[PDB]
Amino acid sequence: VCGIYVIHVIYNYMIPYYWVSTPLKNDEFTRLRMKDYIASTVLEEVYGISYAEWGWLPHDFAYNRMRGLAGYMHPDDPRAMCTSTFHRKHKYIEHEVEKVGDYHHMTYPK
Amino acid sequence: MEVKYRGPSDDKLECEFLENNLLSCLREKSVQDNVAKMTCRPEFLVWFFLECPTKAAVYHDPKGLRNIFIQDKIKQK
Amino acid sequence: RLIEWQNESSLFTVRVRARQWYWIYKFELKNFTDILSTPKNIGNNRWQIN
Amino acid sequence: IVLTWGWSSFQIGGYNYERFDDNGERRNTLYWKLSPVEFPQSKLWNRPS
Amino acid sequence: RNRYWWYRSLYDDYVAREAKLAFGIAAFIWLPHYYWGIHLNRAFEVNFSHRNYAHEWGPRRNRLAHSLEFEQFDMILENWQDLEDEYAQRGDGML
Amino acid sequence: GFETVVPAPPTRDDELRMIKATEEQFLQQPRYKLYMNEAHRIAKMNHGDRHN
Amino acid sequence: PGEVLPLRIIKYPLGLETIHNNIFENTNNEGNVELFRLRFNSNSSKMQHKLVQDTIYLTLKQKRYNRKKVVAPQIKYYTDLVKYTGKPYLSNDKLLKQSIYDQTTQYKLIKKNKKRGELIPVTLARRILRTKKTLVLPAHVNITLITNSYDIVHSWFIPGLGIKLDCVPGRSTHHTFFIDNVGFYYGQCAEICGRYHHHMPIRVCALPFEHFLLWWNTFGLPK
Amino acid sequence: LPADYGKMPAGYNFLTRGKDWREYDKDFILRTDAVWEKFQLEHFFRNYMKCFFFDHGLKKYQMFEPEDMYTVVFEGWALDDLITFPGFTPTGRTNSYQIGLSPRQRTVVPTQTFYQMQDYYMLCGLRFERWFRCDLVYHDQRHTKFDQVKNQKNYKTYPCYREYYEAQYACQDDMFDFLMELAYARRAADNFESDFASHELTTLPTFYDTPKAAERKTYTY
Amino acid sequence: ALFFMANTAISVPSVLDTSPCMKQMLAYEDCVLDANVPQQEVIHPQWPTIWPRLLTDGKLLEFDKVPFHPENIYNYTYMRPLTKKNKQYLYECEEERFVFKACLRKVISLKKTDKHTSWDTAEVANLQLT
Amino acid sequence: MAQTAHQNRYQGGLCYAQCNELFSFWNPSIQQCWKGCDFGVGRVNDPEGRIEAQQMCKRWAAELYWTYKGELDTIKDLRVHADMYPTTPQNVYRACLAGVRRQKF
Amino acid sequence: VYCTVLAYYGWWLYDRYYLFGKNATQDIRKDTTEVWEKRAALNKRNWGYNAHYKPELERSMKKVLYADPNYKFPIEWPERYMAETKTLEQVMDEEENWEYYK
Amino acid sequence: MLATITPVLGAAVIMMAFDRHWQTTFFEYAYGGDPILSQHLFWFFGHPEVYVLIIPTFGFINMIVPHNNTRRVASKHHMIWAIYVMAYMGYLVWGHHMYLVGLDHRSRTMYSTITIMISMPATIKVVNWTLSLVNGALKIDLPFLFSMSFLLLFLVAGFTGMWLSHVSLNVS
Amino acid sequence: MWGNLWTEASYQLNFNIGFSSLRSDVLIHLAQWQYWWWFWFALIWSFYYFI
Amino acid sequence: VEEMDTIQKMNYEATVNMGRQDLITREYTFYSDYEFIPIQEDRKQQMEDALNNLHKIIHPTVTQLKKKANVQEIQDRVFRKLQGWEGELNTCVFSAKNVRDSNFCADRFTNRINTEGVEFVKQILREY
Numbered sequence A: 001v002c003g004i005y006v007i008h009v010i011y012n013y014m015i016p017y018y019w020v021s022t023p024l025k026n027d028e029f030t031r032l033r034m035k036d037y038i039a040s041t042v043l044e045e046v047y048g049i050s051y052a053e054w055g056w057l058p059h060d061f062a063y064n065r066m067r068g069l070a071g072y073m074h075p076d077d078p079r080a081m082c083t084s085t086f087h088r089k090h091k092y093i094e095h096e097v098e099k100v101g102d103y104h105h106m107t108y109p110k
Numbered sequence B: 001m002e003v004k005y006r007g008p009s010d011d012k013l014e015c016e017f018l019e020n021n022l023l024s025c026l027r028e029k030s031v032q033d034n035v036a037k038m039t040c041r042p043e044f045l046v047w048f049f050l051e052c053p054t055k056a057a058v059y060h061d062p063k064g065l066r067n068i069f070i071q072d073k074i075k076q077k
Numbered sequence C: 001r002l003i004e005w006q007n008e009s010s011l012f013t014v015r016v017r018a019r020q021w022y023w024i025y026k027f028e029l030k031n032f033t034d035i036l037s038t039p040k041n042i043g044n045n046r047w048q049i050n
Numbered sequence D: 001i002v003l004t005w006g007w008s009s010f011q012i013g014g015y016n017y018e019r020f021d022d023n024g025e026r027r028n029t030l031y032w033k034l035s036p037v038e039f040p041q042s043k044l045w046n047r048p049s
Numbered sequence E: 001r002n003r004y005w006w007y008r009s010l011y012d013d014y015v016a017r018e019a020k021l022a023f024g025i026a027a028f029i030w031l032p033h034y035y036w037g038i039h040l041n042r043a044f045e046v047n048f049s050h051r052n053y054a055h056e057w058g059p060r061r062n063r064l065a066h067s068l069e070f071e072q073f074d075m076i077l078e079n080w081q082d083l084e085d086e087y088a089q090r091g092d093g094m095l
Numbered sequence F: 001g002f003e004t005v006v007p008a009p010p011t012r013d014d015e016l017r018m019i020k021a022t023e024e025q026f027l028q029q030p031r032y033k034l035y036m037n038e039a040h041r042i043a044k045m046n047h048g049d050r051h052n
Numbered sequence G: 001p002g003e004v005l006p007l008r009i010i011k012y013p014l015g016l017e018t019i020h021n022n023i024f025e026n027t028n029n030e031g032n033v034e035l036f037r038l039r040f041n042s043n044s045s046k047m048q049h050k051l052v053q054d055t056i057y058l059t060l061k062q063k064r065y066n067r068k069k070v071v072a073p074q075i076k077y078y079t080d081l082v083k084y085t086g087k088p089y090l091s092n093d094k095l096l097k098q099s100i101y102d103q104t105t106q107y108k109l110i111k112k113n114k115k116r117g118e119l120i121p122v123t124l125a126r127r128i129l130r131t132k133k134t135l136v137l138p139a140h141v142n143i144t145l146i147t148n149s150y151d152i153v154h155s156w157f158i159p160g161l162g163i164k165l166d167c168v169p170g171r172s173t174h175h176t177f178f179i180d181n182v183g184f185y186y187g188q189c190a191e192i193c194g195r196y197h198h199h200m201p202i203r204v205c206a207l208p209f210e211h212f213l214l215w216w217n218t219f220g221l222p223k
Numbered sequence H: 001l002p003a004d005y006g007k008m009p010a011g012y013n014f015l016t017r018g019k020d021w022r023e024y025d026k027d028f029i030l031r032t033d034a035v036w037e038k039f040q041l042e043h044f045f046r047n048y049m050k051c052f053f054f055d056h057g058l059k060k061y062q063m064f065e066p067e068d069m070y071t072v073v074f075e076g077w078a079l080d081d082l083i084t085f086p087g088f089t090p091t092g093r094t095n096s097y098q099i100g101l102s103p104r105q106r107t108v109v110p111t112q113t114f115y116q117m118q119d120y121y122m123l124c125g126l127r128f129e130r131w132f133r134c135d136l137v138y139h140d141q142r143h144t145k146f147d148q149v150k151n152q153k154n155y156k157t158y159p160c161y162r163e164y165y166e167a168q169y170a171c172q173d174d175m176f177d178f179l180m181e182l183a184y185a186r187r188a189a190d191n192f193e194s195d196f197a198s199h200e201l202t203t204l205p206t207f208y209d210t211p212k213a214a215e216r217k218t219y220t221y
Numbered sequence I: 001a002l003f004f005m006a007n008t009a010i011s012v013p014s015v016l017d018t019s020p021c022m023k024q025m026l027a028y029e030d031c032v033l034d035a036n037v038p039q040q041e042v043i044h045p046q047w048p049t050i051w052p053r054l055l056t057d058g059k060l061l062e063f064d065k066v067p068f069h070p071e072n073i074y075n076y077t078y079m080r081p082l083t084k085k086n087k088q089y090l091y092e093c094e095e096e097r098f099v100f101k102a103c104l105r106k107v108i109s110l111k112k113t114d115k116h117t118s119w120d121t122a123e124v125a126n127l128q129l130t
Numbered sequence J: 001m002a003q004t005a006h007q008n009r010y011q012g013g014l015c016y017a018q019c020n021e022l023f024s025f026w027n028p029s030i031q032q033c034w035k036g037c038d039f040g041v042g043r044v045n046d047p048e049g050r051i052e053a054q055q056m057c058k059r060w061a062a063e064l065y066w067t068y069k070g071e072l073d074t075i076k077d078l079r080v081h082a083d084m085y086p087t088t089p090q091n092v093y094r095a096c097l098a099g100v101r102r103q104k105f
Numbered sequence K: 001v002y003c004t005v006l007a008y009y010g011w012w013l014y015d016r017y018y019l020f021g022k023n024a025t026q027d028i029r030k031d032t033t034e035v036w037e038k039r040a041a042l043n044k045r046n047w048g049y050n051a052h053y054k055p056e057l058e059r060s061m062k063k064v065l066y067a068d069p070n071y072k073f074p075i076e077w078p079e080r081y082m083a084e085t086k087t088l089e090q091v092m093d094e095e096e097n098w099e100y101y102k
Numbered sequence L: 001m002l003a004t005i006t007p008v009l010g011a012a013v014i015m016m017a018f019d020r021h022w023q024t025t026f027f028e029y030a031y032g033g034d035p036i037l038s039q040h041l042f043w044f045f046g047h048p049e050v051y052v053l054i055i056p057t058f059g060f061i062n063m064i065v066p067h068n069n070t071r072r073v074a075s076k077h078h079m080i081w082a083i084y085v086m087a088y089m090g091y092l093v094w095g096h097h098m099y100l101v102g103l104d105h106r107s108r109t110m111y112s113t114i115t116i117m118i119s120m121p122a123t124i125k126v127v128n129w130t131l132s133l134v135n136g137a138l139k140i141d142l143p144f145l146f147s148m149s150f151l152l153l154f155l156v157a158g159f160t161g162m163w164l165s166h167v168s169l170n171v172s
Numbered sequence M: 001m002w003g004n005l006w007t008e009a010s011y012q013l014n015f016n017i018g019f020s021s022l023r024s025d026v027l028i029h030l031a032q033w034q035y036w037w038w039f040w041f042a043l044i045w046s047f048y049y050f051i
Numbered sequence N: 001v002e003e004m005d006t007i008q009k010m011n012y013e014a015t016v017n018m019g020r021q022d023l024i025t026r027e028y029t030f031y032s033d034y035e036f037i038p039i040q041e042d043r044k045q046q047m048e049d050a051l052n053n054l055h056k057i058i059h060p061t062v063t064q065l066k067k068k069a070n071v072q073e074i075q076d077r078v079f080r081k082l083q084g085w086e087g088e089l090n091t092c093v094f095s096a097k098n099v100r101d102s103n104f105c106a107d108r109f110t111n112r113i114n115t116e117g118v119e120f121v122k123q124i125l126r127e128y
């Protein structure tokens, strides 16, 4: 398990660090985005919200839902992609939200 | 928030200040702010009804308000 | 999930510099405008920018 | 010593604190619906940490 | 299951008697902890509900109080304007 | 390095034809070729074929 | 080094602005968009002027509380003429009343001998956590804290918020900051730094945006 | 309903003076505790928006910066920096609103180039380098064609404003000062980076390095 | 994890809003937001009387302001009188404004009397116990 | 997909698959494309629902980034490419529109 | 059989990730047009667009005004969050020359 | 473990001496150096140092109990494997001493996962001690009582240290 | 103190046994987690007792 | 310009001072620098006129191209020729002895732009 974790780390964190070391004439931002994406975005993040009921009560879940929708507002964020949606009701019981997509503001859950 | 409780002050000087502001606002707004210089501060109006219940009750009473208006007119000549 | 990876989406920025034995907090000029442009929840969860 | 005290003392303490001391509330507060809750005891004092 | 397999799985050592006697006592020592944890969870939920209400309806009530005070001023202003009209009729006999 | 005429945004019929073409091309991928869905996928697949 | 050569042809960058779908920032008087620029060096010996510092900050220096010698009365001038001199004290009913006591004597008696007890709250017993300035921030919103250090590593440690940001020299570390309640939190330095490692306190006040805006317009905007 | 229903009558003053308010009693519901709750409203306001204190010597409202309980209680006699209370809003209206995050701003140099690192030092250098290129283009035209003009008739926003603000955001003032020293050293000599750059001759080829760069991109609705 | 907390208090509901005229206030505020008026003073239903200059010239302050200089459009918003479009789309919100003002006046007319024996235990009726 | 409707991209269906195929795997525009798939669920087939979905995309772009009133109405080319990143409201709008186009049913 | 089940689960994850388009295309063809239309109708949400005031008051004038198909709002909903691109003089001139429909 | 880790600490302190007295700017950010490298080198030495401090005491308890209980230890091979696994995994957990210095989140996740997984080799030791304490001929001795005190202290210390790898708690 | 709004958050007494304050979400989560962490030992604890 | 308030006066002073950086630094000259005869004002105006004439030709083509890549490619293709000519001009002006030599070099550069530069630009634009 430890060796698999270390190999996974070196695959996407160590070696890709050496791909770009000089300013690039063509699509420099594209290449830097590629290097960063294969490292910054990890799978676990999605679970971190896909099972948010394991520690978030209903009301805390509602508050953290609005907080997460605010904090992941920026569109240019590959980590926000591959992250389970905050437009969801609490599995146990939902108080604030009556329907998933019935809002008065697009970027606010109410 | 942990807001503590404190009742209306009814302080003499504070209520005199708030009542002077209220009289200025009444005189200004009774003519749709046609004065040369308007000194009314609307926000303090709110505080007049939060910390001077006795004077607010006097102003609501028609006879008390009539007396206040007569005295203010005498003062303004 | 709540205290990390949200630098891009912040209302405004404060700089904390730790000189020896006292702190320095810097508000940049742009912050001023960032505080003027703030949506407000008015009515039934409707947001307005003035 | 091993079982009864280490598994009931803190619960008894919290129950007595809420029952008698009102969980140590600073009572001079205005609106319960707008005030933070003084939580009952939650850090166990009968565990080493 | 398999008694022989489960009686020497733990490093060929036998603690099955103490394991068997552990369930009966362990079935009751967790009740005070569980009930007080229920109390604590309810307190946490109530606090989170209060946080949501103060975040949402906190600002709204202050505006309602502001409008109440402005409406009191409006009533006083209507009466004051009626008095001003009367004084406009009675130029100086009112005083 | 000239440029070509940009057609107007497609109507619903053209969008439906595009969706049909995309799904038909999706159906053609062999299950033993593990290429993820991405812009370069088809290109990669072509490359892979030639490489093989 | 070398020289500023007599002529330089400079390519105007394209696409730096997308405000109204225009990729040509510059246009000459004839109305034709410009792709190139000519820069000339008229004077070959003069120095080149230093870049003017555009950056302007509101800087709050939070240091430990300094002991008072005398309680100076509140004095307001018309200039150089005392318009109003007073000795205000904040009463228990939230009024700045006129004090009939000697404020210096009260200060010195609190300094000398103040009543204390075993179970005394941290609110009423502040000896190492006192500063002369407060960092005021809004609540229920996102603040990017850029942490850095002038000389050595310090640790901005807020126990009430349960956070600690390591201020490291040469590292402009960006942290997200969200406070979900109205709260006045004290804090300390949690990285060994020298003489006054213990006496390096922090005070952060998270307030609702109306009160934060009042503080910002009254104490922040005037710089 | 008349065809002009909803049209504001000419000379409408929005005035409610001398109006019968007994016709609206069926358009709202007040619960039995409305009298109690009203008081609570006032109470909360009187103790929540009252961050200022009336002064008898000045006979006016004053205030001070946020202070701890120990200083407010045991140093109430020794108060410093008292400023006359100016009001929450200039016009006296209400300001008690719930806030949120305003829309983001366009990015010229993305943060996602170096986003795995919480410390923005390579990103700071990259953004400052891009701004310095833009400045080297426009630095001497600023006082004649841009923000620093004498008259507002010829006022134009400096083309490097966004890159400058991004670089300022990514860098602390110390590192920004270091980079400004470097920028001065390179602008005194007029050192464009293209005068020295040759590393593209020792870089591996990429699909983005094709001679026909405009035709490499496939556009699709 | 799955059942680490061993219990979740779903019984405690959201705090019920029992404010006197909150519904009318929110309705009026939504209606005013529909009008899309730059002036914020219109949020209060009493604006025609508190700030009558909004209907004549818009001068609400006697040059005692700090909103910076009139360099952009988003300046001196309260120093801008209501236009014909703003006045029309505010008149469309007249009935809700009147209902809000009537609710406020009725609430003001409510006085604490000696027959309110349940004043000291009004929290229970206010539904503060969950 | 914190801003979208589904916990995982597989619940989005064919529309999310087409959005993935539209952009490179490191491009965050896909998420915006996904939002298009959310806006045109019951609207694509309705002749005015399509216009409503495009208006929803315009509002979404205006809310994510600061925008000017005419800015999204004067876009010369609404086509997208693989390396189009949501750095501007125009790019957000284009990605959202492309997602709307790919929403069958 | 434990190894076989683990291998099958791993292959299922790999196929789900890598053949998303093919799987979704196959799933879209398992139901007829009517079923998919019903499902799409059930999942139709406004998402916060054009969430203007909905008059609940019975005597509200805006209730009848909104029932009118020819009613024009002062500004389009997507334009309520866009910065103005014209001068204040132009804005005031346009608003003062504005005339109400009907 | 000491043979592996000693040169790293020696190099770090020699670099510190050169930086102090020759102005080599090894740990000065202004012209190339980085202060974080010093923490990396020192803690790469340091966590194995605490492990080499603690393991021989594990050896001490494993001899007294079999001596006084008149029976074989529960499983000596598993205890040896547990200490060897702790030694091998002590080289990949030093970063838990540097959570807040601004490490990349991948590094923090790696360090936290490997540090939390230390609890499994350490639980093997406790289970083996408990199983070695049963079903035997017990002779109560002062070394035995000291071993029991060690057992209690180690239990508390190990649990508390395991809590410290919970990153959110570790920040506070 | 900010007016009658007591912005103070700690109120931590001497001989304090737990967290300084529970007015922040992180510390509330940690407190609940610690309590329930101590809940899940019963059987194991009981087992050792008998041993 | 005299009548204004304090803020307007300060802003005017700031705008004036931001333009006198060339005035303040002209006194601080270096002895060891390699001086050259600068390009005269009339030659500067002629060179700028030639550049504007070039911009006249390219304007419809670049404003009718909807791709930034094509416009950047057009800019790069012309810039290489212009940079070669600029290098020739810089060498021949730095190595100039009198104003006659500097005028000769500037005239040669302007004539190159007006004779071959326009032809090269036209060929490029026809290609696009």
Ligand code: HEA
Pocket: L049, L050, L051, L053, L054, L096, L097, L098, L115, L116, L118, L119, L122, L123, L126, L154, L155, L156, L157, L158, L159, L161, L162, L163, L164, L165, L170
């Ligand atoms: C030799 C001494 C020693 C030992 C053995 C350990 C062992 C462990 N340590 Fe410790 N540690 C130090 C000495 C030691 N440590 C020192 C000196 C520092 C200071 C460094 C500095 O200044 O920063 C430090 C710092 C330190 C930190 C960083 C704290 C901070 O950054 O300042 C962390 C967590 O990241 C940590 C964790 C651990 C863990 C998980 C173990 C694990 O190996 C523990 C393994 C034990 C178990 C996990 C099994 C427990 C047994 C049970 C069956 C549990 C059940 C029992 C009950 C519930 C009571 N240690």
Ligand SMILES: CCCCCCCCCCCCCCCCCC(=O)OC[C@H](COP(=O)([O-])OCC[N+](C)(C)C)OC(=O)CCCCCCCCCCCCCCCCC
Pocket: D001, D002, D005, D006, D008, D009, D010, D012, D013, D014, D016, D017, D046, D047, D048
């Ligand atoms: C991780 C493991 C932790 C524990 C490991 C072991 C080490 C610690 C061992 C502790 C041993 C007990 C010490 C305390 C003893 C007193 C208990 C106490 O005060 O608890 C506080 C608790 C709590 O008291 P409290 O209600 O004041 O709570 C504190 C309240 N606050 C915090 C708000 C101030 O009190 C009780 O539990 C009282 C009820 C129990 C009383 C039991 C008396 C009878 C004892 C019988 C002994 C056995 C039978 C003998 C028969 C003889 C026949 C001849």
Ligand SMILES: [Cu+2]
Pocket: C020, C021, G153, G154, G155, G189, G190, G191, G192, G193, G196, G197, G200
């Ligand atoms: Cu320090």
Ligand SMILES: [Cu+2]
Pocket: G154, G155, G189, G190, G191, G192, G193, G194, G196, G197, G198, G200
């Ligand atoms: Cu320190």
Ligand SMILES: [Cu+2]
Pocket: L046, L047, L050, L093, L094, L096, L097
């Ligand atoms: Cu360690």
Ligand SMILES: [Mg+2]
Pocket: G155, G190, G191
């Ligand atoms: Mg440290």
